[PDB]
RNA sequence: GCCUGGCGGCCGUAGCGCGGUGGUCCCACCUGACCCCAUGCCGAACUCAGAAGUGAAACGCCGUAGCGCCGAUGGUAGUGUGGGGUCUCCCCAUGCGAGAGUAGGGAACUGCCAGGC
RNA sequence: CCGACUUACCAACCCGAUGCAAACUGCGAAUACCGGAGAAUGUUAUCACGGGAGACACACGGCGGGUGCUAACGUCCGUC
RNA sequence: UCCUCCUAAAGAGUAACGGAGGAGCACGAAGGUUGGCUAAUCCUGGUCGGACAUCAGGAGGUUAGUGCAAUGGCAUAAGCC
């Protein structure tokens, strides 16, 4: 019938930025719905609850890809 | 004791004469022999724990295993699954003597070869042939169930071999004597 | 098989071991010989080992794979890192249970003074 | 015997195969798989006419380009959609 | 007619018609119905087209239709006002781009084929080329 | 130097399949188990003590490219910026340039430690 | 018929070729966007705080679209 | 009023009486940890288990599962004991 229904989302994507200042933990990719094609691996243990991956210390942040299933990894490591 | 006579006689033989095997353990070994039986849709019967119990632990005290259906497809009225499914495997060298009293009902009498049950012949690795009569009754009264109990028995070896479809028991289940 | 449910066992362990980037105490147990190895935490280079299909060892013990050759070469790992200077290794279950000869493997690691 | 003479191309790319196409001709390549690929050009309309004798793509043909022959088999013929033109022609080296 | 019999959701956006054509050559038959141009065949004047075709070669050799119409357009009847939801369907069309082969044709020689074919080319409201000879 | 075991790096050029090869060097089958632990029953699974036998399965190595996988130069589609013709589309200058296919590549390489020669 | 069945249809399925998708992706641009280093230019344009507003009825054209009939000097969006 | 996809132009955001669906809960385990296991489907032998009820092997990689819509994820399976 009438099918005018949506639903309010705010931020689904990546913001890491790598040289900004910002003390330790930061949102790098935040309501990425998601936990294994973007783990966490540099910097200790990412991915808490609702998966934002979040930073451990100071320092840029690295995108690579490794495993055997070819997913992504966020790690950040300092200076 | 039992497996290592049953490896004393017409094994061994099996290597060299018909099929030549490079290794002792190239012949397909007798590995676990399974029962599975066919009880239905009724859970309100209680025959079925006892006669596991009577068809495993005829010389032990062993316990069957049931599972309800996790697979959970079927048409029929019930989706998530009673236990239907009671699996039972033997133990040990109770195996060999489960096949030795099996063999030794089957060949002296025609009762357990009554006709021709051994028709089908595998060489898959799997053979099954529904028994529906018994073996050894632990308890004086050999027939005090009313059921005719057509549980399937499979025998998990490769059967290329046809030693086992003419010695020990043949397609047309004929004891022959001289 | 065994080993793909083995090293599938070990995944979580051996994981988290390299994701807190923590010194490992790997074990290998076969039915004729039992083996150990430290390693360091980047994984690819490790610091010392000890089995018993090393003479070292095995001379002293009439079965290699036994609850006290376990024994033995755990206070043979736990010796050789004391005097290499290395503590605090973390014991890698490695998908085995943590029973019988690696029970006894840790035990022996535990009373020749290597920490946890 | 159906020998075709072509030019080495001057240039390479978008605008260039377009100028081409405007001005009578077509790119072409050859290529053989154990020497470097050789990029040409030639008349649109002899092409055309060897091309409608269906013996194109069965012989090998020689190709005169800059004085040295080399002899090659018709790979694959990339075609106008709605013209009885095409565009490009592929040589695999025989 | 000349519909899905199934289709994951009703109705499906206008879009608009992409560049080029896609699958030029003839590939079953000998000869086809080479576009040229944009439009949109609906499935009413691709069954017109197919039955003059049929009937001008009286049932020898075989047809092959190429294109599908997959695409529901959605007429807005007479006297109702703009808004209030989308209209319901009335046809079901093709897109078309310039090369697609819509038809094909094999075992009916050169002059019955391009016979059926101006029959055919009568009928659409598409243009037609001419590259007539033997497949290989 | 050769052959194995463990942990890694890179993640199919690293995979599947065919044919061959190694046996208390090693590895894996194997005997027994109400000794410790275990089976929603089962010493197939997991453990313990081990002695016979085996390379059969499995593992590892080498030829096999039959398929997986990688895959260029070109061309094509597209597009950023200027300009032009217009039934909804396209062209020209310029920069960037696919995807699918094609020629082909390809049946790995390398690090630390331990064992037998 | 546990042999005359197994054809003049699906051989459920599977293989080869050809298409089609905003709510398909084993691929994947140009651009935009975020963050670094460098020169040159720009009345520091950028950011913060404080005083004072206006405005919250927009229109056409190009490009990307939803709707409409790829109708409208139609309507609703993104960008100039 | 609140979720999911598309329109939405490969950062976010982005309208319509635009196109499709869901929520106003549930669970003291369906939360935690430790320990374990791998699916949907095809086939041959087998009980009036016939195409599917329970078997036993190969193929077959998640084509099933997520308490409930859709999307994004899973082998550390977040799935199951």
Not at chain 3, 26 to 31: A, K
Request: net charge positive; aromatic share 8%; glycine share 8%.
């Amino acid at each position: 019938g009438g099918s005018t229904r949506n639903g309010r989302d705010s931020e689904a994507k990546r913001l890491g930025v790598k040289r900004f200042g910002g003390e330790s933990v930061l949102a790098g990719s935040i309501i990425v719905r998601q936990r294994g094609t973007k783990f966490h691996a540099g910097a200790n243990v990412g991915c808490g609850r609702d998966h934002t991956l979040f930073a451990k210390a100071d320092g840029k942040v690295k995108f690579e890809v490794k495993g055997p299933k070819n997913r992504k990894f966020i790690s950040i490591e300092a200076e | 004791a039992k497996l290592h006579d049953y490896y004393k006689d017409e094994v061994v033989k099996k290597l060299m004469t018909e099929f030549n095997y490079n290794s002792v353990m190239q012949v397909p070994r007798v590995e676990k022999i399974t029962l599975n039986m066919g009880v239905g849709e009724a859970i309100a019967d209680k025959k079925l724990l006892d006669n596991a119990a009577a068809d495993l632990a005829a010389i032990s005290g062993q316990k069957p295993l049931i599972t309800k259906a996790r697979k959970s497809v079927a048409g029929f009225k019930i989706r998530q699954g009673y236990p239907i499914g009671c699996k039972v495997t033997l133990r040990g060298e109770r195996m060999w003597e489960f096949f030795e009293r099996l063999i030794t009902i089957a060949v002296p009498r025609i009762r357990d070869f009554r006709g021709l049950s051994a028709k089908s012949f595998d060489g898959r690795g799997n053979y099954s042939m529904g028994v529906r009569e018994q073996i050894i009754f632990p308890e004086i009264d050999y027939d005090k169930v009313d059921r005719v109990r057509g549980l399937d028995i499979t025998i998990t070896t490769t059967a290329k071999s046809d030693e086992e479809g003419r010695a020990l028991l043949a397609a047309f289940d004929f004891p022959f004597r001289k | 098989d065994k080993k793909s449910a083995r090293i599938r066992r070990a995944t979580r362990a051996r994981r988290k071991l390299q994701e807190l980037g923590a010194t490992r105490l790997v074990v290998h147990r076969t039915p004729r010989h039992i083996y150990a190895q430290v390693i360091a935490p980047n994984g690819s280079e490790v610091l010392v080992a000890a089995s018993t299909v090393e003479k070292a060892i095995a001379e002293q013990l009439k079965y290699t794979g036994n609850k006290d050759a376990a024994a033995a070469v755990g206070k043979a790992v736990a010796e050789r890192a004391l005097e290499k200077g290395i503590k605090d290794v973390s014991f890698d279950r490695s998908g085995f249970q943590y029973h019988g000869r690696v029970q006894a493997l840790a035990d022996a690691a535990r009373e020749a003074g290597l920490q946890f | 015997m159906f020998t075709i003479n072509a030019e080495v191309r001057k240039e390479q790319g978008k605008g260039a195969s377009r100028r081409l196409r405007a001005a009578n001709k077509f790119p072409a390549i050859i290529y053989g798989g154990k020497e470097a690929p050789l990029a040409i050009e030639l008349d649109h309309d002899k092409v055309m006419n060897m091309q409608a004798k269906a013996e194109f793509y069965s012989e090998v043909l020689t190709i005169v380009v800059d004085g040295k022959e080399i002899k090659v088999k018709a790979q694959d013929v990339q075609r106008h959609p709605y013209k009885p033109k095409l565009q490009h022609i592929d040589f695999v080296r025989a | 007619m000349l519909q899905p019999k199934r289709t994951k959701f009703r109705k499906m956006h206008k879009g608009r018609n992409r560049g080029l054509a896609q699958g030029t050559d003839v590939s079953f038959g000998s000869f086809g119905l080479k576009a040229v141009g944009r439009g949109r065949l609906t499935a009413r004047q691709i069954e017109a087209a197919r039955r003059a075709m049929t009937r001008a070669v009286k049932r020898q050799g075989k047809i092959w239709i190429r294109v599908f119409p997959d695409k529901p357009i959605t007429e807005k009847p007479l006297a109702v006002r703009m808004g209030k939801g989308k209209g319901n369907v009335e046809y079901w069309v093709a897109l078309i781009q310039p090369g697609k082969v819509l038809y094909e044709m094999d075992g009916v020689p050169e002059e019955l084929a391009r016979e059926a074919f101006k029959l055919a080319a009568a009928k659409l409201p598409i243009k037609t080329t001419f590259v007539t000879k033997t497949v290989m």
